Ligand binder design. Structure first.
Ligand SMILES: *[C@@H]1O[C@H](CO)[C@@H](O[C@@H]2O[C@H](CO)[C@@H](O)[C@H](O)[C@H]2NC(C)=O)[C@H](O)[C@H]1NC(C)=O
Ligand SMILES: *[C@@H]1O[C@H](CO)[C@@H](O[C@@H]2O[C@H](CO)[C@@H](O)[C@H](O)[C@H]2NC(C)=O)[C@H](O)[C@H]1NC(C)=O
Lengths: 51, 51
């Protein structure tokens, strides 16, 4: 399936297929991102879908 | 008077009394501030009312 949270697929270890986290720094009056962690690359500044 | 845009007062040169500008950097998906210019100090990182 392809849901509202992107593609969903379960491999042989029952995780989701491609997890990724958006590193937020809280310094202003709003949560700004400062990059993105992915399973594939890890600590990118681009969106993790381009990799 | 004290309006919605703070205090308002006109000196002998017909300006407003204390002008100040919020330097915006446009790098994310939103305009973040990176400091504040004031007449009083000029290029502070604190709000210009504290000075
Ligand atoms: C998370 O990333 C890891 C590392 O790239 C991947 O898991 C490995 O994938 C390779 C190729 O598919 C396999 O040969 C390894 O045996 C895998 N290792 C482990 C520990 O699973 C995979 O791309 C991602 N895994 C998940 C569950 O998202
Ligand atoms: C903007 O800041 C300037 C500089 O601090 C000030 O203007 C001077 O103020 C002093 C003291 O009040 C006077 O002696 C000078 O004659 C002023 N100079 C000029 C060119 O006006 C003042 O604090 C602020 N002026 C305005 C219009 O906001």
């Amino acid at each position: 399936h392809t849901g509202v949270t992107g593609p969903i697929q379960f491999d042989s270890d029952r995780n989701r297929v491609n997890p990724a986290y958006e590193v937020l720094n809280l310094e202003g009056t709003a949560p700004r991102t400062v990059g993105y962690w992915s399973n594939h690359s890890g600590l990118s500044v681009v969106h993790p879908e381009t990799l």
